[PDB]
RNA sequence: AAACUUUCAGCAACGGAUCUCUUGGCUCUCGCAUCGAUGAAGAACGCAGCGAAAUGCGAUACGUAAUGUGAAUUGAAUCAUCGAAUCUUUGAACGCAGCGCCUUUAAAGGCAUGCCUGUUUGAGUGUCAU
RNA sequence: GCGAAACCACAGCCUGGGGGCCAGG
RNA sequence: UUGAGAAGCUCAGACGAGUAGGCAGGCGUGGAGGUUUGUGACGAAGCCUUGGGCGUGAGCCUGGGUCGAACAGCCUCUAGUGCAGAUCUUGGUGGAAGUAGC
RNA sequence: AGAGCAUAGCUGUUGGGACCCGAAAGAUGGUGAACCAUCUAGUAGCUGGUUC
RNA sequence: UUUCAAUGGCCCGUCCACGGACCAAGGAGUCUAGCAUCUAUGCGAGUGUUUGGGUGAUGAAAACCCAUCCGCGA
RNA sequence: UUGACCUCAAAUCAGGUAGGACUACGCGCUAAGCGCAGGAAAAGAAAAUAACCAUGAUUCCCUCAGUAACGUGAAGCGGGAAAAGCUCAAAUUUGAAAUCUGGCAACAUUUCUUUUGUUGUCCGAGUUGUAAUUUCAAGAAGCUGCUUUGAGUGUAGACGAUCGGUCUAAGUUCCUUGGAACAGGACGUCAGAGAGGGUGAGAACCCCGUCUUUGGUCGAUUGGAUAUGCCAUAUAAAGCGCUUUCGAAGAGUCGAGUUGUGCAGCUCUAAAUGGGUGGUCAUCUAAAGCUAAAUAUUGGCGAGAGACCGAUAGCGAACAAGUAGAGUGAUCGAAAGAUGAAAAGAACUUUGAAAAGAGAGUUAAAUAGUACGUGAAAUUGCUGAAAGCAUUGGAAAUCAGUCUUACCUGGGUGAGAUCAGUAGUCUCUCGAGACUAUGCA
């Protein structure tokens, strides 16, 4: 139960805030769990996704698939992964997007900012 | 994306009209340059074949090549159905039975099945006898295949057949069951033995079913009656039809000769749900093939 | 209410006698009738058949009224509280509540009333030294001070017989909160527990007593023959 | 026009916080000033004792609090009221005496120039 | 509803959302330090004053107080001198002593003299003595500022220290 | 007999009811106090994304600087913060309604009225002194 | 080829007796 | 003899038009609290149905078809709660009629 | 040798727009050379309607 | 269910007339203050906490508590 | 001839300020019109009540009280919220205009290079009066002896307030259904977090959040205090003792006569123990001024809710909405939400001038194909059958459900348990249940 009258439990406000969230807020909304090994060695439960992250699809029709996140489609809250696509009628391979929570990060693209984020968020590189 | 309904309908209308215009222009210019140069007309017609489910069927290695295979013919010459296909030529003797306490609707279809098969009996199912007990009883009484028409709620929805005495048992779910009255331009069958034709049973499991259906019919049809019973497997749906055929002229036909079909009935469809190795026991049967529903959602994936 | 600027039979018109904010929303009850109902609701909480009749899963509670030590007031973790309810076998009511969480039927879940569930035990404490936070996340459990008993929490729905888990000090202060029928309450001014219309409420004990069955005229038949 | 009281409990809370704010500012000293005891002015209520506005100049002179330092320690001064009877004088002189009995006034920093 | 409010809904610019809604939030005690170090931030000011041993009101209270536990002449009112009162709690005792000690530190209210004042009073003293301030005042040749005998006495008394 | 007419049933239309939803309204409460001659509110005209019958922005034209997150959009950003800049023509609108003027180098800086305070310069058969 | 609108409880054989009721044509 | 929902069960006899008007008991809808260890993607609600059933009735239960995400019984609370009509309001659709007519 | 006071419910009744719709005016402030916006839910013995 | 047969059967509301082409949806004794009776409830020569104050750590617009008045009654 | 002052002018001289908009709440003039403000406004420290044991600025709430008064309709008192008091005019500083704006020059300072001051100097304002002192509650001037004292500027730390960043618990284990597991079951975990939202169906443990947080940490801006340093123009300024001394108090106003709506107009026009207002007494002390809080708030900048509405409802507007559109104009003013989990929005072949059609293909579903959730009725077409309101039955079509397998009795064969002329364990209260052995009379 929330006790703060600063936060709203109104569904209308939560739904408006989610879908009218800006691209900087959507950056945090698209977060994926790390694998067990990364979770137990970086001491971080979950990170926002990024391009060039190595992930495994955990739920859905594409369960078990792996690949690198080619891009993040933040407008539709969707991820795009290498070779996880769908063939169209004409023979084109139109990519299919998956929710960031439905994948798991198995190899992080470690920039310098992530390492600073890791140490800041109770982590040990 | 446009959350105004009218505008998104006008935006689609403009998009649709432009899409139709430039696809027509591309078609028109292609038509002009093809009639001018046939060398690209049939060139396109030889690669741009429309795709269909059968052409896009998922790969299964169990599909047998048209060329004869020794290993398959080694396994098929001494199996349960061998006494029908060997030099013995054992005449099939069918037993037809309904589920316990069936209605007149079940018998109005069982009679049509009886018409489809000469020398096939029908013992009304009575008392506390079971399918594993009829099989033993019919085995000692000279029968070689027992069909059980299952109905509930005044509709025949299933058909299990067991190959006597211990041959494979198949479980089908009938559908679209039409009687001869319900068929337009029907006919009255005669006593002539029908001729069976079977199509499109490519997979090896298909041959197990095809031999099971072949073993029901007498191996020597009476051609003078020109009655033909068709078992066709399309996208795993088995269609059972009976027809009267008479050859005549046909300008559309390749050799100028074509046959006219008059439907005899009954008309129905089956789906193969279970195949068991032995007498049909629902609880303790050795499952040869179980039809997983979640795997049949692929419209391009067939087991028959 | 609706807007004051917003015939009633004409579409896009105005409704008949539009709603006003100055409707009577609250209602007064004599403070003695409020206190009588709190006393009646507490007395019912000590009848195990009224607790079962209200839906509580108290079939393995050691004793009703269920009163626990004052160590419970100093609980810190929900694990300690969930453990306590399991030894006193009050947790089956918590399983009843946790399993009963549904989505609401109606438009009421478009109005922030999304979920519904049953009501678990009412823990009544005397001092808050950690008990409230250790118990407040177990679904259906409500904690309340013994100085501020709420009729809304003592007869949910107007239905009598809530399952109350008292602490020793809460139970000790019940006589100061409510008083006697002859002696006054210490924590209410000049307040005495209501008196009853009958003395022994078992009327079948009165009717079938030797006092009354010794002077009655001999009874005719039950359902009589035709 | 109807005056509706839906903010009756929101007013109650706001006034408590204003009291809480007032204390936070001057917390060692009372949130209210002291008042005299006066007798209501009619034949119906003259037997009651109620709070007045401030103490008279005769009352402060008799107690020992000059009218200038009276306000600085939270003693209101009503110049309008007077003492027509000795009962009101001695009732409120004693009231100031009791208030001064419990008063702890904290010393202030006083300018002390180096020269004479 | 209003056009100014639709102006904001139909624009992607965020609102000036300020999150300062803290209910059950009591004001924190600046002002004193001894009171701040003995203030229970949960309890009411009445409870906090009462626990600290202070009076929140020197007047009556216009409502019932919280009861938690079942607890079991003109010349006489004018010349009486009440000898303070005991300090019930240790916080009030701490306030009392620090105020007395702070008075001791800032206890030199008495003023020294200056060069002008010292020569002024001394010159008057040498001619008139150290006891006849009335005749000192009536002199005008030496008492140019025309101080009265009461201001001359303070100068004389102040010169010694 | 058939058409036609009616009734019933099936299917196909037509229509958009119902049901379910809902970034909307309505109502109550709480907190706060901030427009303009240093050019407001409003109006027009542009710019690029585009669907504009929407939005943002102003010739630095979805904005530039600085800060932050840190790597997009479909040192990135149709991001957030935001103290520095810039902000077309109007409009209380202010040189007169193109026409003019003053100063400086076509460009730039200016040119409304009332009143307040002061500064400077003028006038008085206004008074007075020499 | 284009193409309404007003209007519409329901419908349309006569005679007599009390435009459908009664008895006849 | 088990037949105390004592608000239950049981015996008997008489009676039955009904406008205004009075009294009582019930059926239904939106939301509220409690409750049914309630129902639900193995299909909620809605809708369709010469399928069946219950009640004098208001109405309720159900089979089948359609459908695709929520719903209901019981005890209280509450109300913007029940339509055949107001030359009612809004929308939709008819016969007139392929007529008048251009 | 006092029976009242409070709360709630039903019923009646009185005033508020007062069961719903329907009436010829006029006033204040504007627009164009009558019109427009409020007042206005103007005035009801009356008409039509008023749901298991 | 459809139809046939024999029998009966004159269009509904409203006050002759007035409304009715059909269908769906919406559509009218409401809320509030005063008074009177009746019933229930609590207390009872009393009675009424909710102007306000206290208090409420789980939601705090609630619930709980109550000083001084004041009403009506006597 | 000169100068001083006065009055009136001029300047694109320097420095300012006013307008217009909003207007829920405020205050005025006359719902509307007109004028003017603020974060509140207005009111406000008695020319106020009362008749008492008297009260004590204002505002607000309750009550008084639907009372008095003349259907209108209060007020004194009483209960409460909040409480805070003051500034001038009228008396010579007269041993000293002690007062102030501005220019210039320095210096300091900042929410700020944007702000705000200090010191010095020069001119101006001002004696037709700027300061100090005084405001009736008094007060001045003496006299007296007790107690008192900063408009200064730094540093330090603490406590507060605001603003931005940062810190945080636990399953995506196994089985079944499904296009998808967020469902069912099994087994676990966290809980100061089981609010809410998202994710391909009901998610505390997938994600954002939530709780901790009534807080640690980190920047930055400031409150009032505290400790301390350096300065301090005190030859000063106060409070209260006393008096052989004084004690100023607001006029075209009050009041009277007469008209219009207390107020205003017009005619007349005062007083000094006076004047006002109440019952000779009491009580105020007008015609000058300021003043927080308690109170109001359909606007502004934001929040958090709800027994509210659920697309003919709810704002006119859930979307393009004051928009499209109408009118010369003032003004008036709509209708319009939903494919799917994902466009995978239908490749390709073919007919047709095209629009589109048919083969096909995607989907779990095309009975989801944008004229897209569900898809009612009125209504229209086609096909099939029959014919040319109620009662009762016939014909035709259709439909409901409908039982056989059990009871008893006898024997044979084995099985065990609640049986044993049997041994143990656990939980309750001797024996009651649950068991594990061993035997089968």
UniProtKB/Swiss-Prot annotation, chain A:
Superkingdom of this protein's organism: Eukaryota
Signal peptide start-end: none
InterPro entries in the record: KOW, Rib_uL2_dom2, Ribosomal_uL24_CS, Ribosomal_uL24_euk/arc, Ribosomal_uL24_KOW, Translation_prot_SH3-like_sf
CDD domains, per the entry: KOW_RPL26
Record GO biological process: cytoplasmic translation; ribosomal large subunit biogenesis
Compartment(s) of residence: Cytoplasm; Nucleus; Nucleus, Nucleolus
Gene3D superfamilies reported for this sequence: 2.30.30.30
GO CC, one annotated term: preribosome
Keywords associated with the record: Cytoplasm, Nucleus, Ribonucleoprotein, Ribosomal protein
UniProt-annotated stretches for the region Disordered: 1-23
MF GO annotations: RNA binding; structural constituent of ribosome
Pfam families, per the entry: KOW, Ribosomal_L26
Main location: cytoplasm
SUPFAM superfamilies in the record: Translation proteins SH3-like domain
UniProt family annotation: Belongs to the universal ribosomal protein uL24 family.
HAMAP family (alphabetical): Ribosomal_uL24_A
Record's subunit section: Component of the large ribosomal subunit (LSU). Mature yeast ribosomes consist of a small (40S) and a large (60S) subunit. The 40S small subunit contains 1 molecule of ribosomal RNA (18S rRNA) and at least 33 different proteins. The large 60S subunit contains 3 rRNA molecules (25S, 5.8S and 5S rRNA) and at least 46 different proteins.
Name of the protein this chain belongs to: Large ribosomal subunit protein uL24
Source species of the chain: Schizosaccharomyces pombe (strain 972 / ATCC 24843)
Curated annotation (Swiss-Prot), chain C:
GO molecular function terms listed in the Swiss-Prot or TrEMBL record: RNA binding; structural constituent of ribosome
One GO term of the biological process aspect: cytoplasmic translation
One GO CC term on file: cytosolic large ribosomal subunit
Localization per Swiss-Prot or TrEMBL: Cytoplasm
Keyword GTP-binding in record: no
Keyword terms of this UniProt record: Cytoplasm, Ribonucleoprotein, Ribosomal protein
Keyword Ribonucleoprotein found: yes
Family indicated by similarity: Belongs to the universal ribosomal protein uL4 family.
Extra remark: There are 2 genes for uL4 in S.pombe.
Function: Component of the ribosome, a large ribonucleoprotein complex responsible for the synthesis of proteins in the cell. The small ribosomal subunit (SSU) binds messenger RNAs (mRNAs) and translates the encoded message by selecting cognate aminoacyl-transfer RNA (tRNA) molecules. The large subunit (LSU) contains the ribosomal catalytic site termed the peptidyl transferase center (PTC), which catalyzes the formation of peptide bonds, thereby polymerizing the amino acids delivered by tRNAs into a polypeptide chain.
Description of its domains: The eukaryote-specific C-terminal extension harbors a nuclear import signal and delivers the ACL4-uL4/RPL4 complex to the pre-ribosome, triggering uL4 release from ACL4 and incorporation into the 60S ribosomal subunit.
Protein name from the UniProt record: Large ribosomal subunit protein uL4B
Organism expressing this protein natively: Schizosaccharomyces pombe (strain 972 / ATCC 24843) (Fission yeast)
Residues of the full protein shown: 53 to 312 of 363
UniProtKB/Swiss-Prot annotation, chain D:
MF GO annotations: RNA binding; structural constituent of ribosome
Function: Component of the ribosome, a large ribonucleoprotein complex responsible for the synthesis of proteins in the cell. The small ribosomal subunit (SSU) binds messenger RNAs (mRNAs) and translates the encoded message by selecting cognate aminoacyl-transfer RNA (tRNA) molecules. The large subunit (LSU) contains the ribosomal catalytic site termed the peptidyl transferase center (PTC), which catalyzes the formation of peptide bonds, thereby polymerizing the amino acids delivered by tRNAs into a polypeptide chain.
Stated name of the protein: Large ribosomal subunit protein eL13
Quaternary structure annotation from Swiss-Prot or TrEMBL: Component of the large ribosomal subunit (LSU). Mature yeast ribosomes consist of a small (40S) and a large (60S) subunit. The 40S small subunit contains 1 molecule of ribosomal RNA (18S rRNA) and at least 33 different proteins. The large 60S subunit contains 3 rRNA molecules (25S, 5.8S and 5S rRNA) and at least 46 different proteins.
A GO term from the CC aspect: cytosol
Species whose genome carries this gene: Schizosaccharomyces pombe (strain 972 / ATCC 24843)
GO biological process, any: cytoplasmic translation
Signal sequence, start to end: none
Keywords attached to this entry: Cytoplasm, Phosphoprotein, Ribonucleoprotein, Ribosomal protein
Compartments, as annotated in UniProt: Cytoplasm
Similarity field: Belongs to the eukaryotic ribosomal protein eL13 family.
The organism's place on the tree of life at top rank: Eukaryota
Gene name per UniProt: rpl13
Curated annotation (Swiss-Prot), chain E:
GO cellular component: nucleolus; nucleus; preribosome; preribosome, large subunit precursor
Region (Disordered): 1-23
InterPro entries, sorted: Ribosome_biogenesis_Nop16
UniProt keyword terms in alphabetical order: Nucleus, Ribonucleoprotein, Ribosome biogenesis, rRNA processing
Localization (cell): Nucleus, Nucleolus
Disulfide linkage: none
Chief location category: nucleus
Pfam family, one: Nop16
Entry's Gene Ontology BP terms: assembly of large subunit precursor of preribosome; ribosomal large subunit biogenesis; rRNA processing
Self-association state and partner proteins as the record states: Component of the pre-66S ribosomal particle.
Protein purpose: Involved in the biogenesis of the 60S ribosomal subunit.
Family label: Belongs to the NOP16 family.
The name this protein goes by in its record: Nucleolar protein 16
Species of origin: Schizosaccharomyces pombe (strain 972 / ATCC 24843)
């Amino acid at each position: 139960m929330k006790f703060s009258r600063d936060v709203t439990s109104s569904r209308r406000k939560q739904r408006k805030a989610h879908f009218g969230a800006p691209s900087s807020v959507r950056r945090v909304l698209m977060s994926a769990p790390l694998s067990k090994e990364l979770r137990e060695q970086y001491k971080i439960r979950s990170l926002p996704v990024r391009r060039d992250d190595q992930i495994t699809v955990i739920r859905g029709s594409n369960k078990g698939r792996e690949g690198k996140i080619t891009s993040v489609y933040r407008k539709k809250f969707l991820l795009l992964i290498e070779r996880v696509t769908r063939e169209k009628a004409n023979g084109a391979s139109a990519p299919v997007g998956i929710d960031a929570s439905k994948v798991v990060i198995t190899k992080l693209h470690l920039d310098k900012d992530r390492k600073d984020l890791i140490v800041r968020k109770g982590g040990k590189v | 994306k446009i959350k105004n309904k009218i505008v998104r309908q006008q935006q689609y209308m403009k998009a649709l009209h432009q899409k139709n215009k430039d696809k027509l222009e591309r078609r028109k210019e292609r038509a002009k340059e093809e009639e001018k140069d046939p060398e690209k007309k049939r060139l396109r017609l030889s690669e741009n074949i429309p795709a269909t489910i059968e052409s896009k069927r998922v790969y299964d290695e169990t599909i047998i090549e048209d060329k004869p295979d020794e290993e398959l013919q080694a396994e098929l010459k001494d199996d349960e159905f061998s006494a029908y296909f060997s030099e013995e030529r054992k005449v099939p003797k069918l037993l037809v039975t309904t589920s316990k306490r069936a209605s007149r609707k079940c018998y109005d279809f069982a009679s049509e099945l009886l018409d489809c098969f000469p020398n096939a009996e029908f013992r009304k199912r009575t008392g506390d006898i079971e399918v594993h007990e009829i099989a033993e009883a019919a085995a000692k009484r000279g029968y070689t295949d027992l069909l059980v028409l299952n109905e509930d709620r005044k509709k025949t929805n299933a058909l299990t057949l067991v190959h006597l005495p211990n041959g494979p048992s198949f479980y089908f779910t009938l559908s679209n069951l039409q009687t001869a009255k319900e068929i337009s331009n029907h006919g009255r069958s005669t006593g002539h033995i029908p001729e069976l034709i079977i199509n499109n049973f490519s997979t090896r499991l298909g041959m197990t079913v095809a031999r099971a259906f072949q073993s029901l019919f007498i191996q020597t049809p009476q051609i003078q009656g020109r009655q033909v019973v068709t078992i066709h497997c399309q996208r795993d749906f088995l269609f059972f039809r009976r027809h009267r055929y008479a050859f005549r002229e046909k300008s559309n036909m390749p050799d100028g000769i074509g046959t006219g079909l008059q439907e005899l009935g009954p008309r129905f469809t089956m789906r193969l749900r279970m195949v068991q190795k032995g007498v049909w026991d629902r609880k303790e049967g050795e499952v040869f093939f179980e039809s997983n529903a979640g795997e049949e959602s692929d419209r391009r994936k067939f087991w028959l | 209410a609706v807007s004051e600027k917003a015939g009633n039979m004409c579409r896009s018109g105005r409704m008949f006698a539009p709603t006003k904010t100055w409707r009577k929303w609250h209602v007064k009850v004599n403070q003695n009738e409020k206190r009588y109902a709190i006393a009646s609701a507490v007395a019912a909480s000590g009848v195990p058949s009224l607790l079962l009749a209200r839906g509580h899963r108290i079939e393995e509670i050691p004793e009703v009224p269920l009163v626990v030590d004052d160590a419970v007031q100093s609980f810190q973790k929900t694990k300690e509280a969930v453990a306590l309810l399991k030894e006193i076998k009050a947790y089956r009511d918590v399983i009843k509540v946790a399993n009963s969480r549904k989505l609401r039927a109606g438009k009421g879940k478009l109005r922030n009333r999304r979920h519904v569930q049953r009501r678990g035990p009412l823990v009544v404490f005397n001092e808050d030294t950690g008990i409230v936070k250790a118990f407040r996340n177990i679904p259906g459990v409500e904690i309340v001070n013994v100085r501020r008993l709420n009729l809304l929490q003592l007869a949910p729905g107007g239905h009598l017989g809530r399952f109350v888990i008292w602490t020793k000090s809460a139970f000790g202060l019940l006589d100061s909160v409510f008083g006697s029928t002859t002696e006054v309450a210490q924590l209410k001014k000049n307040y005495f527990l209501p008196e009853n219309i009958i003395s022994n409420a078992d009327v079948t004990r009165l009717i079938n007593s030797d006092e009354i069955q010794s002077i009655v005229k001999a009874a005719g038949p039950s359902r009589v023959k035709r | 026009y109807v005056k509706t009281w839906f903010n009756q409990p929101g007013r109650k809370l706001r006034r408590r916080q204003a009291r809480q704010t007032k204390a936070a500012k001057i917390a060692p000293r009372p949130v209210e000033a002291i008042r005299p005891a006066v007798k209501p002015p009619t034949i119906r209520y003259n037997m009651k004792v109620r709070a007045g506005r401030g103490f008279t100049l005769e009352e402060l002179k008799a107690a020992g609090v000059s009218r200038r330092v009276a306000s600085t320690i939270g003693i209101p001064v009503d110049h309008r009221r007077r003492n027509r009877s000795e009962e009101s004088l001695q009732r409120n002189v004693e009231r100031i005496k009791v208030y001064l009995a419990h008063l702890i006034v904290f010393p202030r920093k006083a300018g002390q120039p180096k020269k004479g | 509803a209003n056009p100014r409010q639709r102006n904001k809904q139909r624009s992607g610019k965020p609102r000036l959302t300020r999150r300062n809604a803290n209910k059950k939030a009591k004001a924190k005690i600046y002002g004193n330090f001894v009171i701040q170090q003995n203030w229970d931030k949960h309890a009411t000011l009445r409870q906090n004053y009462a626990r600290l041993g202070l009076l929140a009101t020197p007047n009556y209270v216009t409502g019932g107080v919280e009861k938690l536990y079942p607890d079991p002449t003109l010349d006489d009112v004018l010349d009486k001198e009440i000898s303070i009162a005991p300090a019930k709690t240790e916080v009030v005792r701490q306030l009392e002593e620090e105020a007395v000690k702070k008075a001791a530190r800032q206890s030199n209210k008495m003023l020294p003299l200056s060069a002008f004042e010292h020569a002024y009073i001394q010159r008057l003293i040498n001619k008139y003595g150290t006891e006849d301030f009335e005749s000192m005042a009536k002199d005008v040749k030496l008492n140019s500022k025309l101080f009265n005998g009461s201001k001359l006495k303070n100068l004389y008394i102040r010169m010694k220290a």
